[PDB]
Design a binder for this molecule. Sequence first.
Ligand code: CA
Ligand code: CA
Length: 270
Amino acid sequence: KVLKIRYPDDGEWPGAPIDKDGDGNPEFYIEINLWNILNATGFAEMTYNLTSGVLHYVQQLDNIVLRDRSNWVHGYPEIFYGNKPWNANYATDGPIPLPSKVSNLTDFYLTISYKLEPKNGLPINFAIESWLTREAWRTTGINSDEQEVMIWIYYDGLQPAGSKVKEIVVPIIVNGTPVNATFEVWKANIGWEYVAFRIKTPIKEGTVTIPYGAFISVAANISSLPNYTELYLEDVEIGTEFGTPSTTSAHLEWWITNITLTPLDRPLIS
Ligand SMILES: [Ca+2]
Ligand SMILES: [Ca+2]
């Protein structure tokens, strides 16, 4: 048994739950999410092997035209845990109770094993993203007084939105080795507040572990938003943004072979 979703054959917005114990509460949810592609030729397909646990993405898209060039990237094919606030999809069968208020959450490690193969110079990142919203069970998008936080652990040729704030150093684990890694902190106004942490030494494949609160505490600390502790950390999404307006061909393959969220006995926001 292999779960398969495919653009364009399954429609504009292919996606599916991953629900191992068939309890109607998925452990994860996957989406091809070509959200700024207006038209393209070719296909993108994601499969999830229900026995090996391997998620594999193959994308061969050409003649790409974007919905809105100012939104810059083409899409973000991804797997996520929690409530994704832009639609009715969710996955909450896991150890971290997302969505919950930031002020109520425990810290946790996020560990991902993956391997990226962008082709032909394609601008891409591998980025973890969370939305922070005033409503826990939002399904209709994001307002100007809410936040998006991204953590980029790989990039080539893509830059985050907005402007550079500072650099921080965060203890992470890369392929089993503790490393004090430097991230650039970027902050933008793009319809809501955006904060991205772009690592300075990108990791194209392997197993990387981050302490999630190191990043959410900085995003809180630098926010312009009012009543930040009212916000719900909705989800943790993991995927690859790819393309810029210079890109008309985007061929990419990747694999994610494990995602683990590990609770810690300390608050999320330090
Ligand atoms: Ca389930
Ligand atoms: Ca949702």
